[PDB]
């Protein structure tokens, strides 16, 4: 679309390598603003990376690590905001890339602004022209103290920069790869300019350069983009009280008429994923959710992994299982690792038992993600979550996935009530006996065209149909979560209890 989320993988190995490039193709296709970190890792030598050609802004950091692609096509990329930094210091990190494989040229033709953070280029045997770039020009005026560790060790001959490059500062062999200088050339005290002359100065709200002197002509926005106009702040919704008709909402680095689908509106006018302190989530008839101050002391809510006391807890275990008893909505995520059902002898924590998973029988909403890398082998399905209706995906596992099921022994999903996957992707891989992945209407669950299901190494569909494990005839359109009439997504004829009948 226009904005997309990033990834939080960092240097970790892909969970499902056989679909890794596909998640990347689903995350960044047609996306211009990466509202997160742009992590390109573990890419095979001949990977097709054409889906990254529309990216112009990364709000977090850019990490290009452990790749064999000779070129990464990020030429359009204009500004890295550095809201998040790699290793807490770098907004651009190019590490361990490398007939011979490995990144040969950065080719960041449009990169002219790095608002916060620095540059880390280490151990790239075939990279060229990385030392010639005047990184002080790219860094913002208030980001001058940013570090800049650029390794120079090279295992190949480095051709000279193109003759057209006046200062021999180039991103590549090509004449089009000459670096454009914005900060340094500026006559006067201009932060950025398009040319030597004082008239060529950029407006104060512009970032990374400008096509002209006005605030519309900025190549990027230093603070906020209000419909092509760069602004210090989004217009206020109220002007002390009466409504301001021209007021907007602050979402990312943009001013928007309304907060997006999965986000929360705040009274001050910010679009958020978690309500502020002493605030509660208030849904409406149309389905928009807003953050409101608690009129009386806030009612107790149910927190999951990644939130409050459970912020550093990695898995749902017998130590914290009773925190979810009777819990209809969980603010946070649920992860089920092998440590959950195997136990930790050092901590003396007992292994989780199947029956205790019946604390999740009233669960209806997860605001974070659902990650299951281990399940009890007695249970043939995820029927403890059969009343779960929505996984919001406001917190994503690895930054990309709201529903992940790997290495399980479940024969069918059995997620009858699941109807919405608000954000993020679904990953189902290496579940040997799982037969009902394809029968699920995943497009109905997904709310964005970016969202997709990534499945691999599960039980072959021909094998499942040959066994006779398939959708019930009573199920409408072939959409079911498991065998039998209880598992139908929609009843074709009639409903008695939870079961389809005729």
């Amino acid at each position: 679309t226009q904005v997309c989320t990033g990834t939080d993988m960092k240097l970790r190995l892909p969970a499902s390598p056989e679909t890794h490039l596909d998640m990347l193709r689903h995350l960044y296709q047609g996306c211009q603003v990466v509202q997160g970190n742009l992590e390109l890792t573990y890419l095979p030598t001949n990977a097709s990376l054409s889906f990254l050609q529309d990216i112009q802004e990364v709000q977090g950091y850019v990490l290009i690590a452990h790749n064999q692609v000779r070129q990464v096509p990020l030429q359009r990329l204009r500004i890295v905001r550095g809201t998040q930094l790699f290793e807490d210091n770098y907004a651009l990190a190019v590490l361990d890339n490398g007939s011979p494989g490995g990144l040969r040229e950065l080719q960041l033709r449009s990169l002219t602004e790095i608002l916060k953070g620095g540059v880390l280029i280490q151990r790239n045997p075939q990279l060229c022209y990385q030392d010639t770039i005047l990184w002080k020009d790219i860094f913002h005026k208030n980001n001058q103290l940013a570090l800049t560790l650029i390794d120079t060790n090279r295992s190949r001959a480095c051709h000279p920069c193109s003759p057209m490059c006046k200062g021999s500062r180039c991103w590549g062999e090509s004449s089009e790869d000459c670096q454009s200088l914005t900060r340094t050339v500026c006559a006067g005290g201009c932060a950025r300019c398009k040319g030597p002359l004082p008239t060529d100065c950029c407006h104060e709200q512009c970032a990374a350069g400008c096509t002209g002197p006005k605030h519309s002509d900025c190549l990027a926005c230093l603070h906020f983009n209000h419909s092509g106009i760069c602004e210090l702040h989004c217009p206020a919704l109220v002007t002390f009280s009466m409504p301001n008709p021209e007021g907007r909402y602050t979402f990312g680095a943009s001013c928007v008429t309304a907060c997006p689908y999965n986000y929360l509106s705040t009274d001050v006018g910010f679009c958020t994923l978690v309500c502020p302190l002493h605030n509660q989530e208030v849904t409406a008839e149309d389905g928009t959710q807003r953050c409101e101050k608690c009129s009386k002391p806030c009612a107790r809510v149910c927190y999951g992994l990644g939130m409050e006391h459970l912020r550093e807890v990695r898995a749902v275990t017998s130590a914290n299982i009773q925190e979810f008893a009777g819990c209809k909505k969980i603010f946070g995520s649920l992860a089920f690792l092998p440590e959950s059902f195997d136990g930790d002898p050092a901590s003396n924590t007992a292994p989780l038992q199947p029956e205790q998973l019946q604390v999740f029988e009233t669960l209806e909403e997860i605001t974070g993600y659902l990650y299951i890398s281990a399940w009890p082998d007695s249970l043939p399905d995820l029927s403890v979550f059969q009343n779960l209706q929505v996984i919001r995906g406001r917190i994503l596992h690895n930054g990309a996935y709201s529903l992940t099921l790997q290495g399980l022994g479940i024969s069918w999903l059995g997620l009858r009530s699941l109807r919405e996957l608000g954000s993020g992707l679904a990953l189902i891989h290496h579940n040997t006996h799982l037969c009902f992945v394809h029968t699920v209407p995943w497009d109905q669950l997904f709310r964005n065209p970016h969202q997709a299901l990534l499945h691999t190494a599960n039980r072959p569909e021909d094998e499942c149909v040959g066994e006779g494990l398939a959708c019930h005839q009573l199920c409408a359109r072939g959409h079911c979560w498991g065998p039998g009439p209880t598992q139908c997504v929609n009843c074709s004829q009639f409903l008695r209890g939870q079961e389809c009948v005729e």
Partner: antibody, heavy 127, light 107 residues
Framework: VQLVESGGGLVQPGGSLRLSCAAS????????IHWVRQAPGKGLEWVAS????????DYADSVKGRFTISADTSKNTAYLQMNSLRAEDTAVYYC??????????????????????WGQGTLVTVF | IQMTQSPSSLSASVGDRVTITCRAS??????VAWYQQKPGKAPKLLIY???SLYSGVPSRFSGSRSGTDFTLTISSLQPEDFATYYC??????????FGQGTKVEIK
């Protein structure tokens, strides 16, 4: 993003004093502006808070009814008016910003539940 | 008026690991913050959400919660880590409260 204090000094008991704190972008950042005092040789004590959005105010029990906190949105400056000061009110008064919104992942703006920025402090002495 | 802080005073050498526990009213973990104040200077924020590291703060500062107790831990004490340490809490109804203060003195 800085906070600059002003208008602190020597006050006669039962008198009044007006403390000024200027903050960059207070009325649109969505944050609170607090006043926190530190008596000499004692610890930090919270005094008052003002919301940007609606001008909602809050005070500590000790200062409730004597101190009034206001904001001038046009000049973007918070004012603390102190009346009927006593010996206990002699303190260094810091103005601090609480609840500022920061960009996080996925384009979400989240409030900071802490005092990220403090003023340098102004000494108020009641004699 | 002030949540309890223990110890009131603490003495240690450079490199030592030191713990401060703040007994406060029971509340959500995001309402407890930890601030460092050098004498004569304004306080600076260390741990906003009782575990989360503020920007520009060294990783040697850690926060943890154990029931109503909130713990500030310095893994390796440094010469610039001798100051007063405060725990602050936000309750519903707009009240902000502070700890009494923990002072770390060099040996």
């Amino acid at each position: 993003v800085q906070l600059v204090e002003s208008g602190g000094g020597l006050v006669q008991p039962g008198g009044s004093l007006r403390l000024s704190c200027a903050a960059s972008g207070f009325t649109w950042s969505g944050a609170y502006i607090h006043w926190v005092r530190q008596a000499p040789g004692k610890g930090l004590e919270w005094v008052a808070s003002i919301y940007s959005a609606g001008g909602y105010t809050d005070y500590a029990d000790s200062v409730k009814g004597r101190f009034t906190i206001s904001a001038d949105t046009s000049k973007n400056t918070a004012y603390l008016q102190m009346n009927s000061l006593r010996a206990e009110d002699t303190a260094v008064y810091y103005c601090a910003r609480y609840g500022t919104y920061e960009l996080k992942s996925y384009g979400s703006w989240e409030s900071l539940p802490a005092f990220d920025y403090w003023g340098q402090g102004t000494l108020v002495t009641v004699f | 008026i002030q949540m309890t802080q223990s110890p009131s005073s603490l003495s240690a050498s450079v490199g030592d690991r030191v713990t401060i526990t703040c007994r406060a009213s029971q509340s959500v973990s995001s309402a407890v913050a930890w601030y460092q104040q050098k004498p004569g200077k304004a306080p600076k924020l260390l741990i906003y959400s009782a575990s989360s590291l503020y920007s520009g703060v060294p990783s040697r500062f850690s926060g943890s919660r154990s029931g109503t107790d909130f713990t500030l831990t310095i893994s390796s004490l440094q010469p610039e880590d001798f100051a007063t340490y405060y725990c602050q809490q936000s309750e519903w109804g707009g009240l902000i409260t502070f700890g009494q203060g923990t002072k770390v003195e060099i040996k």
